Each structure stands twice: as structure tokens, then as C-alpha cells.
Symmetry: C3
Subunit: 151 residues, 3 copies
């Protein structure tokens, strides 16, 4: 008897939380975030060298942007376009030249290379930047690019 009343009580509290949270999700993503599927991209709004950007994302409980589909890539591109700053992706071929992988060592399941890329220009481009047009280019990891993490 009393338990049925508690259940109905919990239903009302849960509905309130769901509604309140749905509103805050939109508020939170504006203007530096993008939701795509179950992934969320968020830019720090500034630029940093690869290693520093990687650390920022990992320490925050996530990792550098790792678009695994056209949909995620387009979502990420929106942030790049908004800030008008090419961003770093999480993938590199630092372990084995010519073989780009995710931080986990897994090979890419998606790529959107601009024509002729990756080309390891000057024999020293192991990181990846995404342009405002959504295309990718391998680039020197020492360069500073917009920091975007995924959660």
C-alpha cells in the first residue's frame, strides 16, 4: 500500500528531472557544443599543440574529437566553422608511419581526407586537422589547432 504511493511519488519526481534536464542539455550545448547520436563534441574555444590538447581532453574525462562517421564529422565541422579555426582530431600515425589510429590503437573506421592526403609533408606530419570544409589533412603535431573534445 505505502509502497505503491512511493512509486507514484517517484514517477512525479522523475518526470520533473527529465523535463528540467532536457532544457539544460540545450542550454549547455550553446554555443560551444554539438550533440550527435550519443556523442557530444565540445570546443574549449582556443588553440593548443596536439600533446597539450590531448592532455586537456583526457584529464576532463574524454578525448580529442574522433569522428567515426559522416554524421559525427559534420557535427564537428559545425564547431570548426563557428570558431573559424581548424581543429585537431585524436588520431595519429606516430606509432607506424602511414597507419592512422585512434588513441586505443584501433585503425580508422572512417576518414574524410582532402585529395592527396595524408602526405606526411616534409616527412613530419603525424597528427590530423579538420578544415572548415570538413576535410582532413595530416599536419605537424607541434602546430596549434582549435581544441575540441568528445564525451
Amino acid at each position: 500500500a505505502s509502497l505503491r504511493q512511493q512509486v507514484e511519488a517517484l514517477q512525479g519526481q522523475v518526470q520533473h528531472l527529465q523535463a528540467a534536464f532536457s532544457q539544460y542539455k540545450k542550454v549547455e550545448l550553446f554555443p560551444n557544443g554539438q550533440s550527435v547520436g550519443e556523442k557530444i563534441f565540445k570546443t574549449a574555444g582556443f588553440v593548443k599543440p596536439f600533446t597539450e590538447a590531448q592532455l586537456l581532453c583526457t584529464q576532463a574525462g574524454g578525448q580529442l574529437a574522433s569522428p567515426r562517421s559522416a554524421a559525427e564529422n559534420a557535427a564537428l565541422q559545425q564547431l570548426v566553422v563557428a570558431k573559424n579555426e581548424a581543429a585537431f582530431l585524436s588520431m595519429t600515425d606516430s606509432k607506424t608511419e602511414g597507419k592512422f589510429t585512434y588513441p586505443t590503437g584501433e585503425s580508422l573506421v572512417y576518414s574524410n581526407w582532402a585529395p592527396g592526403e595524408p602526405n606526411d609533408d616534409g616527412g613530419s606530419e603525424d597528427c590530423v586537422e579538420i578544415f572548415t570544409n570538413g576535410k582532413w589533412n595530416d599536419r605537424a603535431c607541434g602546430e596549434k589547432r582549435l581544441v575540441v573534445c568528445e564525451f
Copy 2:
């Protein structure tokens, strides 16, 4: 069952406390909550058309204060950033008649003395000053972007 229900209650209570803490964190320092509405500034300026798209694409719309209370709330963000902001309303359809994005007429207004005056015959947008008063201004001007959710 009771041991489970009591567990569920514990989870809901935890969520209520964590969510309340999170809301304060989110709103600091670029948002304002007033009633069921939330105003949040992007912290930068854009022309009207661009600011409007930014808000719509984010799932909301440009700041649309409908009462003295909401206007005061929005004013706080303007004062904080010390940058006048665009409101969502315009009289682009019918000169002399300002409306919300849906097309409805204003239910509240806080015009500065003599405004709106369509200065130069080309002011169809609205800006809110640090004093909270409104002034119709050229939509091509860049103002603080503030959306409501």
C-alpha cells in the same frame, strides 16, 4: 521490493541534489534563470540574422522578454558583458508593428523615450541597453548574442 524502492528513492534524491548543483554551475557566469525560462549569452556579437540562426540551431530563439521580470533578468547579462543585445522581435513585415518570431504582437515592451523611431527609415530590429531600455536599431549592426531556452 521495499529494499529496491528505497534504493530508487536514494538514486532520485542523489540526482535531485546533483542536478541542482549542476544548474548553478551551468548558469555561471553566462546565464540567467527567470521562471521557466533561461537566458544565456554566447559572449560575443553578431548581426541579427546570424544571431537568430545561432539560437534557432541551438534549439531556442533570440531573447524575448515578455515581462518586467524577464527583462530585468536579461538586463543582468547585458550589464555583465557591458554589451547591448538583440531581442528576437522585429517589424520587418509591417513597419511600425513589432512582433515575435511566430508573428504575434508584443505582450510587453520597455522602449526608451521616443522609440521605436525607425531612424533613417531603416531600423527593424531591437537592442536592449545596459539600463534595460529598448531601441529599434539597424538589423545589420552587431550586438551581443543572447538566446532563451
Copy 3:
């Protein structure tokens, strides 16, 4: 089965909320224990910074342990701007207290501090190295609140 169902929704809510919390904290917030530090990203004199935090429903950063100090230190380091803490010794020179009047339960003064240099340093700033220094309250420092 309503309990089972409702619990599924709640646990799905816990997952979504946990994800949004990490997103919220990047890159201007830091969580330590049940406390959350968040910087406004700009500087302000003590009084103004204090008002902002209280108006936001929190208070100025008040690290009460080495752990909390380390978390706050991350924000200062990331922003590369020293920040004001909530404590002052305005009521009784030499005795720093929290807004509530309670005396410190933790401190991390840099060597030689607090020295009330100039005869008027009643506020506290935390450097990028995590150490504290008493400073004039009229100076502008990074605004960091705790919730």
C-alpha cells in the same frame, strides 16, 4: 514491474547526467569530492568577484584540503591567472577567515606569507604553483567560484 521500469529510466538518466557533467566542466570547471570549482574566465576586484559568486548561489573558491587546493590549482594553471580565494583577515588583522567567520582549517602560504605587505593586504590569491599570498583586495584576480 513499474519499479524495474522506473529504475531503468533513472539509471538512463544517471548516465546522461554523468555525461553532461563532464561536458559542463570542460574547460572552465573542476570537480573534487562533492565540490565544484568554476571560473568566470575574467578578472575582478575582490568585492565584485565575491558578489558574482554569491549571486550565482555559491561563494569564492575556498580550498579546505590539499586535494581541493590541487583541483583549484588546475584552473589557475589552465587560465594562467592567479585567483582570489574567499578568505580575508579584514575583521582581525592576521587572522584569515571564511565568509562564515570560521578560521582556516587549511592553508598553503608561499614562504614569507602572509606578510600584510604595505600594511594593507587582507585578501588571498592563489598562484599557478598552488601557493597562497595575501594581497590587496582592490587588485583584480581571476574569478573562481565554488558550488
